[PDB]
Enzyme design. Structure first.
Site, PDB file in Angstrom:
ATOM      1  N   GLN A  79       0.863  -1.237   0.000  1.00  0.00           N
ATOM      2  CA  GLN A  79       0.000   0.000   0.000  1.00  0.00           C
ATOM      3  C   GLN A  79       0.877   1.257   0.000  1.00  0.00           C
ATOM      4  OE1 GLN A  79      -2.716   0.703   3.294  1.00  0.00           O
ATOM      5  NE2 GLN A  79      -4.279   1.431   1.875  1.00  0.00           N
ATOM      6  N   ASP A  89       2.434   1.732  -3.512  1.00  0.00           N
ATOM      7  CA  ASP A  89       1.330   2.088  -4.427  1.00  0.00           C
ATOM      8  C   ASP A  89       1.029   3.585  -4.214  1.00  0.00           C
ATOM      9  OD1 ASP A  89      -1.711   2.715  -4.761  1.00  0.00           O
ATOM     10  OD2 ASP A  89      -1.561   0.644  -5.699  1.00  0.00           O
ATOM     11  N   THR A 147       3.793  11.743  -7.955  1.00  0.00           N
ATOM     12  CA  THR A 147       4.969  11.552  -8.821  1.00  0.00           C
ATOM     13  C   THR A 147       5.132  10.057  -9.114  1.00  0.00           C
ATOM     14  OG1 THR A 147       6.565  11.395  -7.090  1.00  0.00           O
ATOM     15  CG2 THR A 147       6.065  13.610  -7.813  1.00  0.00           C
ATOM     16  N   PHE A 173       7.811   8.622  -9.995  1.00  0.00           N
ATOM     17  CA  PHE A 173       9.070   8.127  -9.405  1.00  0.00           C
ATOM     18  C   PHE A 173       8.771   7.572  -8.008  1.00  0.00           C
ATOM     19  CE2 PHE A 173       9.875  11.650 -12.338  1.00  0.00           C
ATOM     20  CZ  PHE A 173      10.435  10.917 -13.357  1.00  0.00           C
ATOM     21  N   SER A 206       7.365  10.645  -2.323  1.00  0.00           N
ATOM     22  CA  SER A 206       6.320  11.686  -2.467  1.00  0.00           C
ATOM     23  C   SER A 206       5.213  11.480  -1.432  1.00  0.00           C
ATOM     24  CB  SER A 206       5.765  11.734  -3.849  1.00  0.00           C
ATOM     25  OG  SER A 206       5.316  10.455  -4.234  1.00  0.00           O
ATOM     26  N   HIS A 220      -5.489  -5.805  -2.348  1.00  0.00           N
ATOM     27  CA  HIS A 220      -6.845  -5.864  -1.734  1.00  0.00           C
ATOM     28  C   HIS A 220      -7.145  -7.283  -1.229  1.00  0.00           C
ATOM     29  CE1 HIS A 220      -7.838  -1.748  -3.590  1.00  0.00           C
ATOM     30  NE2 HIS A 220      -6.942  -1.710  -2.583  1.00  0.00           N
TER      31      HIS A 220
HETATM   32  C1  HEM Z   1      -6.773  -2.031   4.550  1.00  0.00           C
HETATM   33  C2  HEM Z   1      -6.058  -1.750   3.459  1.00  0.00           C
HETATM   34  C3  HEM Z   1      -6.503  -0.954   2.292  1.00  0.00           C
HETATM   35  C4  HEM Z   1      -7.568  -0.119   2.114  1.00  0.00           C
HETATM   36  C5  HEM Z   1      -8.614   0.360   3.122  1.00  0.00           C
HETATM   37  C6  HEM Z   1      -7.600   0.246   0.756  1.00  0.00           C
HETATM   38  C7  HEM Z   1      -8.527   1.142   0.233  1.00  0.00           C
HETATM   39  C8  HEM Z   1      -8.505   1.643  -1.045  1.00  0.00           C
HETATM   40  C9  HEM Z   1      -9.493   2.529  -1.627  1.00  0.00           C
HETATM   41  C10 HEM Z   1     -10.759   3.032  -0.982  1.00  0.00           C
HETATM   42  C11 HEM Z   1      -9.047   2.778  -2.885  1.00  0.00           C
HETATM   43  C12 HEM Z   1      -9.723   3.636  -3.944  1.00  0.00           C
HETATM   44  C13 HEM Z   1     -10.639   2.782  -4.806  1.00  0.00           C
HETATM   45  C14 HEM Z   1     -11.216   3.615  -5.940  1.00  0.00           C
HETATM   46  O1  HEM Z   1     -11.863   4.655  -5.648  1.00  0.00           O
HETATM   47  O2  HEM Z   1     -11.100   3.268  -7.118  1.00  0.00           O
HETATM   48  C15 HEM Z   1      -7.847   2.026  -3.064  1.00  0.00           C
HETATM   49  C16 HEM Z   1      -7.099   2.095  -4.193  1.00  0.00           C
HETATM   50  C17 HEM Z   1      -5.914   1.441  -4.406  1.00  0.00           C
HETATM   51  N1  HEM Z   1      -5.407   0.546  -3.584  1.00  0.00           N
HETATM   52 FE1  HEM Z   1      -6.024   0.021  -1.821  1.00  0.00          FE
HETATM   53  N2  HEM Z   1      -6.574  -0.310   0.147  1.00  0.00           N
HETATM   54  C18 HEM Z   1      -5.881  -1.098   0.971  1.00  0.00           C
HETATM   55  C19 HEM Z   1      -4.733  -1.830   0.740  1.00  0.00           C
HETATM   56  C20 HEM Z   1      -3.993  -1.766  -0.406  1.00  0.00           C
HETATM   57  C21 HEM Z   1      -2.866  -2.563  -0.683  1.00  0.00           C
HETATM   58  C22 HEM Z   1      -2.343  -3.558   0.331  1.00  0.00           C
HETATM   59  C23 HEM Z   1      -2.446  -2.282  -1.939  1.00  0.00           C
HETATM   60  C24 HEM Z   1      -1.263  -2.820  -2.701  1.00  0.00           C
HETATM   61  C25 HEM Z   1      -0.431  -3.824  -2.382  1.00  0.00           C
HETATM   62  C26 HEM Z   1      -3.387  -1.318  -2.444  1.00  0.00           C
HETATM   63  C27 HEM Z   1      -3.306  -0.723  -3.649  1.00  0.00           C
HETATM   64  C28 HEM Z   1      -4.245   0.185  -4.164  1.00  0.00           C
HETATM   65  C29 HEM Z   1      -3.982   0.901  -5.418  1.00  0.00           C
HETATM   66  C30 HEM Z   1      -2.797   0.722  -6.365  1.00  0.00           C
HETATM   67  C31 HEM Z   1      -5.066   1.698  -5.574  1.00  0.00           C
HETATM   68  C32 HEM Z   1      -5.305   2.718  -6.706  1.00  0.00           C
HETATM   69  C33 HEM Z   1      -4.543   4.071  -6.358  1.00  0.00           C
HETATM   70  C34 HEM Z   1      -4.770   5.184  -7.383  1.00  0.00           C
HETATM   71  O3  HEM Z   1      -4.059   5.245  -8.466  1.00  0.00           O
HETATM   72  O4  HEM Z   1      -5.785   5.985  -7.187  1.00  0.00           O
HETATM   73  N3  HEM Z   1      -4.306  -1.052  -1.490  1.00  0.00           N
HETATM   74  N4  HEM Z   1      -7.553   1.339  -1.945  1.00  0.00           N
HETATM   75 CA   LIG Z   2       6.232   9.124  -6.163  1.00  0.00          CA
END
Ligand code: HEM
Ligand SMILES: [Ca+2]
Ligand SMILES: *[C@@H]1O[C@H](CO)[C@@H](O[C@@H]2O[C@H](CO)[C@@H](O)[C@H](O)[C@H]2NC(C)=O)[C@H](O)[C@H]1NC(C)=O
Ligand SMILES: *[C@@H]1O[C@H](CO)[C@@H](O)[C@H](O)[C@H]1NC(C)=O
Ligand SMILES: *[C@@H]1O[C@H](CO)[C@@H](O)[C@H](O)[C@H]1NC(C)=O
Ligand SMILES: [Zn+2]
EC number: 1.11.1.7
Length: 595
Positions: A105, A108, A184, A186, A190, A351
């Site tokens: 997270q 990401d 960013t 990179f 950030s 997720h």
């Molecule tokens: C309890 C843990 C976490 C919560 C509550 C959570 C919650 C969220 C929420 C609400 C979003 C936005 C969804 C949307 O509106 O499209 C999101 C996006 C995302 N999550 Fe998670 N997430 C969790 C863990 C993680 C983990 C463990 C990863 C990666 C290993 C991850 C990677 C991502 C990524 C890459 C996005 C899209 C970011 C962007 O470009 O806007 N998340 N997450």
């Molecule tokens: Ca960055």
């Protein structure tokens, strides 16, 4: 031709070619194309966007309009029929600590953020989208299917707002809609420092000339720093307990308080900046505030790069690590460093690694008090359990001693995220991250599963039997065919996550390819990569080689017992050593002699 560059937003390209430090915005990294990898520009398209109307409207927007001859199924129906499970027993990853999930997270959040469009400022469709579930403009509600228990308790839909897009948001643009990356590209910390000059300055302590980050002045963690509060309203961290009235943290990234263990990781990195700055002030008392902040910032960015590429990616990509991310051969200014739209969905494999509970553990790594173990949904936007419940140390012990959830084709996403997610301004623990992810795939015009399989040089199943063979699962393939009708229509988030994991990895072949290519680009395409000759001296690099998450914990908490391999599943006391035996970062190679 058509628009070769729609860059009316953020046209300020004022680059110092000599500067040994990164900009906050990511501008000036690439000398020939200085906006490449900068925040607040379009996500990259590795393949052309796929919209219902070819330009902007998502598949599933118009009821009558098919994808390849079939209606796209409701995101919530896919969530209910395929992504959900009841039994949390047996679901944990026997060989990944909870820190493995949490680092994913953190990385990401460094790389990508596509924020919802800002048309909700003194607007009805803010609450009207929620209230009346009427689709239109940026309102793209997640409608419940007929048998959904939420139809009984929560009304007709879950509110969902379309992501922000470039060449401003309310009107049209130059062919297909391109969503924004607000951070960013990179891997540059950030998420600690911000990607915007305003935020970046607000986070700094400009009172002292010590290059420190601002710290909480209302609360301390046994005399260790907290992040400052975000003194702006309405606050979701206040909303979730109006008795405790503890606000969200203010960090380099908007999302730092989404859950308590993200807030915890952000707390460790802030502590580490202020620590590095203090050590550098000793070695170099002649260094001004700016110098100290930049040198500490550059070290923290290097720390994040090494933990990620050396410790994390190998145990995500397994066998596929070497295929996609060969050993480093230096900066290649022909590489596109931009985060791709698809990567922002591929990295949501995390997720499926989030378990149903979070523990606080005491100094014997035993339960911390009567309610040591808590349900994850009570910890969304929860700072009060940190401020008023024993600080970050018991949570950090949990990150070490407790396990990630393992992805399972029959147990994909815990109900803590799938039924009880809390979203700011929405008031209830009643949202579905899986459904949000599928709706967002469509929002962003993602090509379907088989387009991505073809991009990755993999087979494109056309039949139930072909999908059974690819997924190595006949029941999972049948549910997906019943819903989607043809594999061409399977949303990339669910299709990539449905594939069995590669040897020694935690993602399937398609995700390993997409992730692997992205990480290769962010490293090779980065002028400021820690291992790019000239960025650090050869001696600095020899010191940086010794960083570990373990040392980070030792330096920035009152935790004295840590594992050597913090991402492995580690059990106390057998897998834990004193901080004394753990390599330190030797900053002596930063000693700066003019006389
Ligand atoms: C309890 C843990 C976490 C919560 C509550 C959570 C919650 C969220 C929420 C609400 C979003 C936005 C969804 C949307 O509106 O499209 C999101 C996006 C995302 N999550 Fe998670 N997430 C969790 C863990 C993680 C983990 C463990 C990863 C990666 C290993 C991850 C990677 C991502 C990524 C890459 C996005 C899209 C970011 C962007 O470009 O806007 N998340 N997450
Ligand atoms: Ca960055
Ligand atoms: C809101 O936060 C308050 C403040 O911490 C919580 O109260 C604590 O509550 C329990 C009683 O269940 C006590 O044993 C603790 O000692 C309390 N501490 C203080 C300072 O009040 C309360 O549980 C929270 N409520 C919710 C719904 O989250
Ligand atoms: C700024 O740093 C000074 C110098 O140590 C410190 O005493 C002060 O509390 C800091 N202010 C903030 C907001 O961190
Ligand atoms: C630099 O990147 C380009 C485009 O990705 C690639 O074709 C070329 O092989 C790279 N250079 C080296 C030396 O790898
Ligand atoms: Zn203490």
């Amino acid at each position: 031709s058509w628009e070769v560059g729609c860059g009316a937003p953020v046209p300020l390209v004022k680059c110092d070619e000599n500067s040994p430090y990164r900009t906050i915005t990511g501008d000036c990294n690439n000398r020939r194309s200085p906006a490449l990898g900068a925040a607040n520009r379009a996500l990259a398209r590795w393949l052309p966007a796929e919209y219902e109307d070819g330009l902007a409207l998502p598949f599933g927007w118009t009821q009558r309009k098919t994808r390849n001859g079939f209606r796209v199924p409701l995101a919530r129906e896919v969530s209910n029929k395929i992504v959900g499970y009841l039994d949390e027993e047996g679901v944990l990853d026997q060989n990944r600590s909870l820190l493995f999930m949490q680092w994913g997270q953190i990385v990401d959040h460094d790389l990508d953020f596509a924020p919802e469009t800002e048309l909700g400022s003194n607007e009805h469709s803010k609450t009207q989208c929620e209230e009346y579930c009427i689709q239109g403009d940026n309102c793209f509600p997640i409608m419940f299917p007929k048998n959904d228990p939420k139809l009984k308790t929560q009304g007709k839909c879950m509110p969902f707002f379309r992501a922000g897009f470039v060449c401003p948001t309310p009107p049209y643009q130059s062919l297909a809609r391109e969503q924004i990356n607000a951070v960013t590209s990179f891997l540059d910390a950030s998420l600690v420092y911000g990607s915007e000059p305003s935020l970046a300055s607000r986070l700094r302590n400009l009172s002292s000339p010590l290059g420190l980050m601002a710290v909480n002045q209302e609360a301390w963690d046994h005399g260790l720093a907290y992040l400052p509060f975000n003194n702006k309203k309405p606050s979701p961290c206040e909303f979730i307990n109006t008795t405790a009235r503890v606000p969200c943290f203010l960090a380099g990234d908007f999302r730092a308080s989404e859950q308590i263990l993200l807030a915890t990781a952000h707390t460790l990195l802030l502590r580490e900046h202020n620590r590095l700055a203090r050590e550098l002030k000793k070695l170099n008392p002649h260094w001004n505030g700016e110098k100290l902040y930049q040198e500490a910032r550059k070290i923290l960015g290097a720390f994040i790069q090494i933990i990620t590429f050396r410790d994390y990616l190998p145990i995500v990509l397994g066998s596929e690590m070497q295929k996609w991310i060969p050993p480093y051969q230096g900066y290649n200014n022909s590489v596109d460093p931009r985060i791709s739209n698809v990567f922002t969905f591929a990295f949501r494999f995390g997720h499926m690694e989030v378990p149903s509970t979070v523990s606080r553990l005491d100094e014997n790594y035993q339960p911390w008090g009567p309610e040591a173990e808590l349900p994850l949904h009570t910890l969304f936007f929860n700072t009060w359990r940190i401020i008023k419940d024993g600080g970050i140390d018991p949570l950090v012990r949990g990150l070490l001693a407790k396990k990630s959830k393992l992805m399972n084709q029959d147990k994909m996403v815990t109900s803590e995220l799938r039924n009880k997610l809390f979203q700011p301004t929405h008031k209830i623990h009643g949202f579905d991250l899986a459904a949000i992810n599928l709706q967002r795939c469509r929002d962003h015009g993602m090509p379907g599963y088989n387009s991505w399989r073809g991009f990755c040089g993999l087979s494109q199943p056309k039949t139930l039997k072909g999908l059974q063979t690819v997924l190595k699962n006949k029941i999972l393939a049948k549910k997906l065919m019943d819903l989607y009708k043809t594999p061409d229509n399977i949303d990339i988030w669910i299709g990539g996550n449905a594939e069995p994991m590669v040897e020694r990895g935690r993602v399937g072949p398609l995700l390993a390819c997409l992730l692997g290519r992205q990480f290769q680009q962010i490293r090779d395409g980065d002028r400021f990569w820690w291992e790019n000759p000239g960025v650090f001296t050869e001696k600095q690099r020899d010191s940086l080689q010794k960083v570990s998450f373990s040392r980070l914990i030792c330096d920035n908490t009152h935790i004295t017992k840590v594992p050597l391999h913090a991402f492995q599943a580690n059990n106390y006391p057998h897998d834990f050593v004193d901080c004394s035996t753990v390599d330190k970062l030797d900053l002596s190679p930063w000693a700066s002699r003019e006389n």
